[PDB]
């Protein structure tokens, strides 16, 4: 009986831990990237790989938000929230670091939310 | 550590026919570590860490597009990062496509 309870709790905690962080990714508009990284993550689960998603988000964003790019793309506006737009005299702030801090907030969000519903079921 | 205002110029010119190349030149003081080319919308930018010593008092960076189209036209300006602080932005340059 204990085994089945632990397994059901692990399943419930995985499915619920991912939803809050999908909120996190569509707040960054990982939705608009035409690579398809977002849809891929949602199909393959494994929510705590989100910091992985981070590095690709940087590469793609750099390409699509460059001063070189042909046309306007929705994701570029999120940079202002990231804080990578500099006031004169300010520190440099690396985009990849800001993206990782966003999704580390998302991931510890997810872990401590999943810890409660792991114990709740049993 | 006050950082001087950088400057933008366009080579060969401000006005480019569609399909031709143009190069944006950002110039600042010696020892700038990063140069950033910016459009009217501040979130659209390119960073580069190759800077070349032009002079004992100046340094520059180059952003080229191999052929323009009507989406490239607009306002452009530079900022540089040197010695722990970002600089002030340069004056705008408008490149127009023909
Ligand atoms: Pt830096």
Author numbering:
A (entry chain B): 190 to 311
B (entry chain A): 108 to 205
Tell me what the authors wrote about this structure, in their words.
RIFIN also mediates immune suppression through activation of inhibitory immune receptors including leukocyte-associated immunoglobulin-like receptor 1 (LAIR1) and leukocyte immunoglobulin-like receptor B1 (LILRB1). To define the structural basis underpinning interactions between wild-type and antibody-inserted LAIR1 and polymorphic RIFIN, we investigated the overall architecture of three types of LAIR1-inserted antibodies, determined crystal structures of LAIR1 in complex with the RIFIN-interactive regions from two RIFINs (PF3D7_1040300 and PF3D7_0401300), and used the resultant structural information to derive a LAIR1-binding signature and to identify RIFINS from diverse Plasmodium species capable of recognizing LAIR1.
To facilitate structural determination of the RIFIN-V2-LAIR1 interaction, we took advantage of the affinity maturation of the LAIR1 ectodomain from antibody MGD21, which increases its affinity to RIFIN (PF3D7_1040300) to 6.2 nM, from lower than 1 µM. The RIFIN-V2-LAIR1 complex resembled a razor with an exchangeable cartridge, where RIFIN V2 is the “handle” and LAIR1 is the “cartridge”. Two longer helices, α1 and α6, and two shorter helices, α3 and α4, formed a four-helix bundle with helices α2 and α5 packed perpendicularly to the bundle. Helix α5 and its adjacent loops (α4-α5 and α5-α6) were connected by a disulfide bond (C254-C265) between α4 and α5; this region (hereafter referred to as the apex region) is likely located distally from the membrane, as the carboxyl terminus of the V2 region connects directly to the transmembrane. The interface consisted of backbone-mediated hydrogen bonds and extensive hydrophobic interactions with highly complementary shapes matching between RIFIN and LAIR1.
